[PDB]
């Protein structure tokens, strides 16, 4: 027999990590450097672009930190994209670009800078940085908050970053992590990046499956077929998505409806209930003991 390590003393001495760290959601080493503002800038907010890719969505937010909790300034979601013509593939690189662009256009519309800072209305996929215009309100500057993502080349967080810079936001970055950057030659190809932004990597995959295996094709792209999304029309679908996104980036909140009260889980038992339950258990145990005797 060996010592119980997780004994009573192991818990008397135990210190728990920050809740968000226990949950595995926040990197507090990274958060401190991202969100903390220089003390000589006082209350000047330090904005950052949050990009989180779930199993079925892309969440893009513009937040600055306060003592009580972050204040989300603007937010766009990939599940909004159907309003703009994109029905499927809401977690690919092209959707990330659309989600990011919608975030930038939505934010600039709010501050009234959309006309001033239109960004790169024509997607070339190349290094582009917006510059403030003298005599006009400065360009909105934020930073990318990649979370726990492994920020390698082609990571979709940089697709959303590319959408936001092309939307008019000022976000420091390089092209090293856009798809099309070649490590061997240390050279960046803007056409390869433009392919991913338009999803030609997805479309080229479709033709591959179609010309290689019909059954594997149906398995991999069943919902593309259902929505009548074909490899030829993909680029114009996304192009029609950008133009509509720039045309109207405003969000209209889903109208909140009253709901009849309904409790879907138990409440805590009261002290009387818990105390009685032990009383019932004790009587039942003795009652069963007396019978067997």
């Amino acid at each position: 027999f060996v010592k119980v390590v997780k004994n009573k003393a192991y818990f008397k001495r135990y210190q728990v990590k920050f809740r968000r760290r226990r949950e595995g959601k926040t990197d507090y080493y990274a958060r401190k450097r991202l969100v903390i503002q220089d003390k000589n800038k006082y209350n000047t907010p330090k904005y950052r672009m949050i990009v989180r890719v779930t199993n079925r969505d892309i969440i893009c937010q513009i937040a600055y930190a306060r003592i009580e909790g972050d204040m989300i300034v603007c937010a766009a979601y990939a599940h909004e994209l159907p309003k703009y013509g994109v029905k499927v593939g809401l977690t690919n690189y092209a959707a990330a670009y659309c989600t990011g662009l919608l975030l930038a256009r939505r934010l600039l519309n709010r501050f009234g800078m959309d006309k001033i800072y239109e960004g790169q209305v024509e997607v070339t996929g190349d290094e582009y940085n917006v510059e403030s215009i003298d005599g006009q309100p400065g360009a909105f500057t934020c930073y990318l908050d990649a979370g726990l993502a492994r920020t390698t080349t082609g990571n979709k967080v940089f697709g959303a970053l590319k959408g936001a810079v092309d939307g008019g936001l000022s976000i420091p970055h390089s092209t090293k992590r856009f798809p099309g950057y070649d490590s061997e030659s240390k050279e960046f190809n803007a056409e390869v990046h433009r392919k991913h932004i338009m999803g030609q990597n997805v479309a080229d995959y479709m033709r591959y499956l179609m010309e290689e295996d019909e059954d594997a094709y149906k398995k991999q792209f069943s919902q593309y077929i259902k929505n009548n999304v074909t490899p030829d029309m993909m680029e114009e679908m996304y192009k029609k998505a950008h133009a509509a996104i720039r045309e109207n980036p405003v969000y209209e909140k889903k109208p909140k409806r009253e709901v009849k009260k309904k409790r879907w889980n138990r409440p805590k038992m009261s002290l009387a209930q818990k105390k009685d339950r032990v009383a019932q258990k004790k009587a039942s145990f003795l009652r069963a003991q007396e019978r067997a005797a």
């Binding site: 258990k281 004790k282 145990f285 003795l286 003991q289």
Partner: peptide, 10 residues
């Protein structure tokens, strides 16, 4: 645990 109570009282 009430189980201990059972062992003592069983």
């Amino acid at each position: 645990p009430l189980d201990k109570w059972r062992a003592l009282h069983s």
